[PDB]
Amino acid sequence: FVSCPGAPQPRYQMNVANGFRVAPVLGGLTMPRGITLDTRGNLLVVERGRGLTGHTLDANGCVTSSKVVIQDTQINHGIDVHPSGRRIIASSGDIAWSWDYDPATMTATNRRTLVTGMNNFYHFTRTVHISRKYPNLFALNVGSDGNIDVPTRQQNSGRAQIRVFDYDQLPQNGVPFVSQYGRVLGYGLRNDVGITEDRAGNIHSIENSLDNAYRMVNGQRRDIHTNNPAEKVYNLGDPSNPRAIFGGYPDCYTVWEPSDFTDSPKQPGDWFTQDNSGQYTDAWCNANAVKPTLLLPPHTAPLDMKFGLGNDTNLYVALHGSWNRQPPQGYKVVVVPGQYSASGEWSPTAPLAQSRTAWSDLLTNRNENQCSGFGNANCFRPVGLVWSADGQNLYVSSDTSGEVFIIKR
Numbered sequence: 101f102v103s104c105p106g107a108p109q110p111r112y113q114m115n116v117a118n119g120f121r122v123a124p125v126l127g128g129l130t131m132p133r134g135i136t137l138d139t140r141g142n143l144l145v146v147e148r149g150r151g152l153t154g155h156t157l158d159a160n161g162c163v164t165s166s167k168v169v170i171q172d173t174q175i176n177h178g179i180d181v182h183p184s185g186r187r188i189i190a191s192s193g194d195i196a197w198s199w200d201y202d203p204a205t206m207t208a209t210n211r212r213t214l215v216t217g218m219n220n221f222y223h224f225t226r227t228v229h230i231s232r233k234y235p236n237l238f239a240l241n242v243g244s245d246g247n248i249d250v251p252t253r254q255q256n257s258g259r260a261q262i263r264v265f266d267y268d269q270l271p272q273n274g275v276p277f278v279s280q281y282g283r284v285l286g287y288g289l290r291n292d293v294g295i296t297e298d299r300a301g302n303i304h305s306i307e308n309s310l311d312n313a314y315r316m317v318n319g320q321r322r323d324i325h326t327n328n329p330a331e332k333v334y335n336l337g338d339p340s341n342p343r344a345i346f347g348g349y350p351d352c353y354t355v356w357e358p359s360d361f362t363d364s365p366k367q368p369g370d371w372f373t374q375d376n377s378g379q380y381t382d383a384w385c386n387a388n389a390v391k392p393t394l395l396l397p398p399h400t401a402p403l404d405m406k407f408g409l410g411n412d413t414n415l416y417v418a419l420h421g422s423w424n425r426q427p428p429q430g431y432k433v434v435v436v437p438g439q440y441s442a443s444g445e446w447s448p449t450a451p452l453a454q455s456r457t458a459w460s461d462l463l464t465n466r467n468e469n470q471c472s473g474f475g476n477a478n479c480f481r482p483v484g485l486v487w488s489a490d491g492q493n494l495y496v497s498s499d500t501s502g503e504v505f506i507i508k509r
């Protein structure tokens with residue numbers, strides 16, 4: 101395999117790990133965000149500002165034709181296909197809807213309003229994940245309204261949190277996100293755009309953390325943003341038994357670089373607060389917040405993740421790349437090694453405190469540190485991931501470059 105028939109050349113230099121090949125399958129798309137595959141293996145793409153587009157595939161996984169499945173200017177990221185293959189769910193910043201779906205023709209009909217009132221202008225993606233273990237259940241993310249959204253201390257803020265809804269219980273015209281139907285799976289989660297599940301049905305989420313981090317040291321503001329805080333994954337567990345896991349936000353953040361913490365020694369994965377005073381101190385975080393399972397580098401901006409299939413026991417993560425770091429970093433797909441229990445529960449191989457070095461590059465730009473976005477510096481910016489059912493092809497969207505790629509074993 102070298103390339104897909106009729107597909108455009110990649111816009112940018114793309115390097116891949118040993119044993120893989122990469123090629124574009126789609127170009128010139130309008131802000132392609134979330135992607136998935138239906139039950140007949142067709143590719144579905146949210147083209148933010150256009151709608152859901154549907155793409156038939158050949159035996160190599162190349163795209164042969166495209167059509168508009170949902171003509172809608174408001175759906176802006178989230179998309180999933182029910183395990184039955186006969187329903188899809190997609191969202192704007194404000195509302196999640198379902199449609200009846202027929203994979204034979206990639207046709208969406210009979211729109212139904214599910215969940216309402218979610219809009220904010222700061223973090224406006226509403227990631228959708230339908231539980232594969234419990235197919236009547238679906239999760240929705242609502243990120244914070246602001247870098248440090250203090251009201252998110254309360255669950256009933258309806259922000260920086262993921263709720264699980266039972267489709268079969270929803271009134272016909274839908275429900276507010278903050279309602280008894282939206283059961284809090286995790287809160288204190290700044291912006292958890294990437295959501296997936298392991299083979300046991302546990303929900304794992306991945307977080308975009310704090311911008312412009314500082315640490316108060318003897319009353320002076322130390323700028324620690326270059327290498328703090330960590331991006332991170334949470335294991336939110338069984339979505340049929342939601343328990344409102346507290347992830348720490350808006351007060352507690354996760355150490356990436358310990359050398360930024362001179363007042364008292366820290367390890368990667370430890371909690372810190374910006375001020376370390378009043379009620380919400382470092383010690384308070386230790387006693388009250390649930391730790392993530394693994395770390396990824398500051399500002400890398402994970403937007404999706406997917407587990408490998410079959411005998412591939414890795415987690416794959418799309419890192420959109422930073423704006424709040426000099427030099428920039430991310431702009432890649434990475435691999436995190438792990439293992440499964442007998443029941444299919446995934447865990448990373450590295451202990452949390454050793455996880456800074458545990459990931460590795462799968463798909464990269466020429467040099468992530470060269471990706472400023474001014475002049476000729478431009479890079480592909482991974483957003484969405486999906487594996488083919490045979491585990492041989494991994495699709496990757498890049499919103500700002502208008503591309504979808506296939507990574508082939």
Ligand SMILES: O=C(O)c1cc(C(=O)O)c2c(n1)C(=O)C(=O)c1cc(C(=O)O)[nH]c1-2
Pocket residue numbers: 223225243291293308309310311398399400401403420421422423424425
């Ligand atoms: O720290 C950063 O440099 C940085 C970069 C990006 C990015 O440009 O994608 C995001 C974030 N942070 C972030 O915190 C966040 O919630 C976020 C959401 C998105 C998105 O594309 O949906 N990008 C980013």
Ligand SMILES: [Ca+2]
Pocket residue numbers: 308309310311399424
């Ligand atoms: Ca950030």
